[PDB]
Ligand binder design. Structure first.
Ligand SMILES: Nc1ncnc2c1ncn2[C@@H]1O[C@H](COP(=O)(O)OP(=O)(O)NP(=O)(O)O)[C@@H](O)[C@H]1O
Ligand SMILES: [Mg+2]
Lengths: 157, 317, 122, 255, 128, 317, 255
């Protein structure tokens, strides 16, 4: 639309929210592949920050592409290499949600504020295969990665 | 265009108008002249129009496809007025058939620029709704008299989101939405079962037996409808045993919804059938209930009562 | 329909059609091998395979038999099946493209008519 | 003029598609509000007024008549477009020709399921009623099992048989240009396929059987043809006579 | 009247779609240049002005209130549509009903995912 | 590009001068200045243009992209004017090249918009069909001679039903589809034998022989296309005494359809061939026939008349 | 001024989309007639008269040049919208960037299949061509099969080969920003995968390989690069020297 469209150029960082994400119950509904910042530069945030971010985006993109296809052709034919990215992606997709402190009236969950290093690390580990055992649901609506581990047990039954 | 509006009006004229105590008014608005002629002479023949005595039960008003816009823009009002007389001046139970009321609105769009008006969406006149309104609001039953009215509504380019048809839904109590897709499958009447509705589809009016078969049929067709996307690339193989049973039943319910009309005998190659409500409620129950999962689909196509569907199955051997 | 919606399906049915097409060439391959290996053994998403046995379901010498057969039939089945799946995906890529261009065109006319309508009312 | 004087005329509007764009050019230049597809609000009337004039008068007005075969060009087989729909909602049937059919070698590329004649059965000759009557029926039963699917292994003798007429019947409907046939010639050949006299034969010979069997009864039997044509029906003797005629011709037909 | 007098009122606007058409008609007939989709350039305003009036007054003003339940008709279940979103961006939430759910047996056809309440649990009893 | 468009445009020129003593015109409608100058020197180097003498066989008319709408609008008419002379004044068979026919139409719309006329469907001019017709129609065979036009077509949005393209096909009697795929086979001219078409490919027009050979060449080319998939996967051998012949011949045919242009002699170090129609039908007739099944593929690559296919075989031992 | 004076100049228009908007704004406020997207009938002429002023002069005129890199912002990848259509139609080629590619890790996001250079090799160096050419070709080949990868439950080693060349060649096209390379450095690296040296290397490592490999030859081998540079191509010699340089570096690399 001419308006939203005309405004991108005036920004240094953009957070694009999507009803398709929101619709799934993932809040904040930011679109991970349509959000950008002028400081997402290795020279500015560092390579650990940068490689994780891009690492997370590749896998979500990789999964976006497969979505429409396993939809019809199903998942059996997929390479274990590719059904692991479906896994990790679905968990990241969740680990990206977070209970806001201003939306307890909405989520029924206490708001969590996560520090930059708790974030980088949490994702780094999911990407590293360090939680391929926990269930996706354990990663939904939690703050730091430790809550995802605790939530796994609570869910363990 | 060419989906079944007129054939359905004809069959209804046959099935309802013919044995109606009370009068009828047929208003041909913007349609074919030959049709007026086809009808008039037919009406004469079955005696609803009698050129000898005063026993005619039908008054005819026409402003067809050959008239200038203004005529097409007013004949509806004219057929309408005739009907209003029987309703209020004689407290009569009227039947009012109009083919096609979409033509009145189209006529309006034809003169509108000439009246000098800024057009609204899709080039239609900004007064579209009010024009439909002060006209549609006289086509109604009242405390003085009853008007059962059946109106054919031509949908341009097949687009039901077109201002004309779009604005007409709100004036009906029951709607029969015909589909090219269904027609092309050979199902007649080509009625879309998940798109037609009726304010009488209430348990407290049609009874729960009726209300539950009705919602039963729609639910299974809705379910079949969502499987269709996958059925479309991969067919049925990958389908669940359970899912394949909805599909079987849905395709048998879909076929059992079709039926031969006297009026369309020359095209169905079959004798017209009239099925009594309880026969319909029933036949559909059984199908739902799995009492015919053994019969083939083709047994159900083009038949009246379920009993004929069983027979057709034997003949199919 | 939205050009963006239609472009998603199209984008994806175009892929499904190439995958499906690739899976048949494979299915034909194995099935070549199989019809040969089958020869000798009798002198001793796969279509409706696993189900056909499944429904009707409710040594060595013969074990290699039912096996050496059940693979020709399977690689046969997957083959034809994936043959028609791309046959279906193709009817759709041709079908959706038409919906895409009707809409594409329609969207452009609709806008211009809006502009012209507003300009003309001044 | 002809319609009005007890005479009979045929009008061919080729195409109403281009007339419609000519009228729209006029309308946009006059500045009339462009609507669906930029067409002016009255393009349906551009056409209804015109085609309402084709008509069959009764005796008290001459019995004369005007027959209109208007042509409309669709884009990509889209028969839902504004103009095509308009025109379908005016005429008394359509004859849709399909591109697929055309390449696949079926010409005239008529689409027998989609096409219709809302008013013509009455106008139809009994002779054809007699043969053409069980032709869509056979062809109805063939329409089904005739899939897009090119490599399909089939079962069931009946359905098999149905599939067998269908391909012959379809060869019988192929026709070249500039060679219009006499109604009595058409019932003749149609008789051959609809009665079974071509069942035992191979789809590739149907064309060749037709010219050969047709010239034969045209040369040798103008006598039966004339009855058919004159009677206007197929009497027991004519039919009996015809049966043997297909019979023997067959029996001598070289593969 | 009820809202300003410490009483409580509930108003249903059924529907705001037909009003927009009326506005569009009235407006075009006044020769005001048509805008997006043929509606006046101020149809958002037409509904914002109205629905802002539904409100909760403080005890200083009687503590009365006005609650509004406006209705809007979508076409082909398309909620992204311009009018639909114009109005979704004024109210404190939406209840979206789908025909798919309805036919499927889910009545009310409320679409959990797409419906929202911007008030959250603050409008709920603790039991609930 | 990359597919020999300009060399094909230049051989046609030459071959028109040669076999029909007719001259040609070149109208660049909305030409990129860079690309005209490059077309200029390229014709020059191949001779079609001669700056020294009076043997030039082409007149160039240019409507560069910087020119205002009105200029790129008319330049195709100017080119037309020129061609009409070599027909109405000297009764030749002229060749008209409009590159590209889409920029003609676009120039039309720009002009239209500037004259403030309401655009029609898709934004084109209300007069799209007349703007085209008044020009296309001047291209024909009159009693004095004939103008034949090779029009470069650009299809917008890859939409063949887009008003620009759709209108244009109303006038076309044939398409010459240059293909990058074919080129990759080394085959040149890189014309696609199955995608290119013509209205006059009717036995009632080209005669049964011509018509049958042509339909023979294509089917074989089609069949081989089928097998192409098999060959690569399951390997080239379940192939029948029959399936192995269709391939052989098809592959001979594919090559026999390629050919050396006299325009590319300054470059291919090879002699150009202008095969005659008679020689063409015979050539392919025999390959179909099976007369050279013993000959080897490469005997047919880049030659003129079948006779050369024979002689090349000799030199290829 | 540079072009005309025997000097060379490069110009970047960022963006032509915004300028079109500026022009449309004045056109409509001066009340000129609006066409598609509300753009004036002369918007095409606004860019064509601009983009044509770029050109290569003749020595007779100084041999000076003006190259132009105009930027157009598409919407939802609608390269056919109005302004993107004009400018594409005016220029000699397009570098198409894509979000999907970008987020998938391909940066710069160049869609190699749809990007084009009408000028082509008439502008490549012999060194580059020596490599560019086979790369262009294996890539086009990969592009045909790529989609199969993710479901390639059993592909022949023929095509399985092209998938491998495919992903390595693709990783070689990747690039960080602000670090443009010298044509000699680009061919040395391209040679590495194109020749097959990284075929047994892990896709995940090519980025690391190149970086270090290039660091090495820019350090230790500036005499070979100077050759490649000078000789303008890859001599049979320098070819052999590169073979050893990469086969020993690779060995080093996987220790
Ligand atoms: N109930 C039916 N059974 C069988 N065929 C039917 C039936 N209804 C319509 N048809 C076929 O469809 C054709 C068009 O029927 P009709 O009822 O006149 O359509 P319509 O909606 O009135 N067309 P139009 O007024 O031109 O938009 C008929 O002539 C039949 O050939
Ligand atoms: Mg009708």
């Amino acid at each position: 639309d001419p308006a939203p469209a005309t405004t991108f150029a005036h920004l240094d960082a953009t957070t694009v929210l999507s009803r398709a994400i929101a619709e799934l119950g993932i809040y904040p509904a930011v679109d991970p592949l349509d959000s950008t910042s002028r400081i997402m530069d290795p020279n500015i945030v560092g390579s650990e920050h940068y490689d994780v971010a891009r690492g997370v985006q590749k896998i979500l993109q990789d999964y976006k592409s497969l979505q429409d296809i396993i939809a019809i052709l199903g998942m059996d034919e997929l390479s274990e290499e590719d059904k692991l990215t479906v896994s990790r992606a679905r968990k990241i997709q969740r680990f990206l949600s977070q209970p806001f402190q201003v939306a307890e009236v909405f989520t029924g969950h206490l708001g969590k504020l996560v520090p930059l290093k708790e974030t980088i690390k949490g994702f780094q580990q999911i990407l590293a295969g360090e939680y391929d055992h926990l269930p996706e649901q354990a990663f939904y609506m939690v703050g730091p990665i430790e809550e995802a581990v605790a939530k796994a047990d609570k869910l363990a039954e | 265009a060419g989906v079944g509006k007129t054939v359905l009006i004809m069959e209804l004229i046959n099935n309802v108008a013919k044995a109606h105590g009370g009068y009828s008014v047929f208003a041909g608005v913007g349609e074919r002249t030959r049709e007026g002629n086809d009808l008039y002479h037919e009406m004469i023949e079955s005696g609803v129009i009698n050129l000898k005595d005063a026993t005619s039960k039908v008054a005819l008003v026409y402003g067809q496809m050959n008239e200038p816009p203004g005529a097409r823009a007013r004949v509806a009002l004219t057929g309408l007025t005739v009907a209003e007389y029987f309703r209020d001046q004689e407290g009569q139970d009227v039947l009012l058939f109009i083919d096609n009321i979409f033509r009145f609105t189209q006529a309006g769009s034809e003169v509108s620029a000439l009246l000098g008006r800024i057009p609204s969406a899709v080039g239609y006149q900004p007064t579209l709704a009010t024009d439909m309104g002060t006209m549609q609001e006289r086509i109604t039953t009242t405390k003085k008299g009853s008007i059962t009215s059946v109106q054919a509504i031509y949908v341009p380019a097949d687009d039901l989101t077109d201002p004309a048809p779009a604005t007409t839904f709100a004036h009906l109590d029951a709607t029969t939405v015909l589909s090219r897709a269904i027609a092309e499958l050979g199902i007649y009447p080509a009625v879309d079962p998940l798109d037609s509705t009726s304010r009488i589809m209430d348990p407290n009016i049609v009874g729960s037996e009726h209300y539950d078969v009705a919602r039963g049929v729609q639910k299974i067709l809705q379910d079949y409808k969502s499987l269709q996307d996958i059925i479309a690339i991969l067919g049925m193989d990958e389908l669940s045993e359970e899912d394949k049973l909805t599909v079987s039943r849905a395709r048998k319910i879909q076929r059992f919804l079709s039926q031969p009309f006297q009026v369309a005998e020359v095209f169905t190659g079959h004798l017209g059938k009239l099925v009594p409500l309880k026969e319909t409620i029933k036949g559909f129950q059984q199908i739902l209930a799995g009492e015919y999962d053994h019969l083939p689909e083709q047994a159900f196509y083009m038949v009246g009562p379920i009993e004929e569907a069983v027979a057709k199955a034997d003949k199919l051997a | 329909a939205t050009l963006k919606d239609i472009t998603r399906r199209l984008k994806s049915i175009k892929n499904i059609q190439k995958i499906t097409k690739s899976m048949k060439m494979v299915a034909a391959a194995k099935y070549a091998r199989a019809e040969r290996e089958l020869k000798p053994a009798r002198v001793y998403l796969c279509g409706a395979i696993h189900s056909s046995v499944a429904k009707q379901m409710k040594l060595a010498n013969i074990i290699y038999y039912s096996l050496k057969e059940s693979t020709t039939s399977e690689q046969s089945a997957r083959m034809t099946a994936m043959d028609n799946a791309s046959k279906n995906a193709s009817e759709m890529i041709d079908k959706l493209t038409l919906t895409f261009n009707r809409t594409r065109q329609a969207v452009i006319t609709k806008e211009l008519i809006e502009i012209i309508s507003g300009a003309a009312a001044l | 003029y002809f319609r009005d004087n007890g005479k009979h005329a045929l009008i061919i509007y080729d195409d109403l598609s281009k007339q419609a764009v000519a009228y729209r050019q006029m309308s946009l230049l006059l500045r009339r509000p462009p609507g669906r597809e930029a067409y002016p609000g009255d393009v349906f009337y551009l056409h209804s007024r015109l085609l309402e004039r084709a008509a069959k008068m009764n005796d008290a007005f001459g019995g004369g008549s005007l027959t209109a075969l208007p042509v409309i060009e669709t884009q990509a087989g889209d028969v839902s477009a504004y103009i095509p729909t308009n025109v379908i909602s005016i005429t008394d049937g359509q004859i849709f020709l399909e591109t697929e059919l055309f390449y696949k070698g079926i010409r005239p590329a008529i689409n027998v399921g989609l096409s219709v004649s809302r008013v013509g059965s009455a106008a139809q000759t009994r002779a054809m009623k007699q043969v053409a009557g069980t032709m869509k029926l056979e062809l109805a039963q063939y329409r089904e099992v005739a899939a897009f699917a090119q490599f399909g292994s089939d079962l069931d003798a009946a359905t098999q048989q149905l599939l067998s007429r269908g391909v012959r019947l379809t060869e019988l409907l192929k026709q070249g240009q500039y060679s219009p046939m006499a109604i009595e010639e058409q019932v003749a050949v149609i008789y051959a396929g609809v009665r079974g006299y071509l069942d035992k034969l191979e789809p590739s010979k149907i064309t060749k059987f037709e010219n050969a069997f047709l010239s034969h009864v045209i040369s040798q039997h103008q006598a039966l043809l004339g009855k058919i044509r004159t009677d206007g029906k197929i009497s027991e003797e004519s039919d009996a006579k015809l049966k043997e005629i297909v019979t023997n011709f067959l029996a001598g037909f070289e593969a």
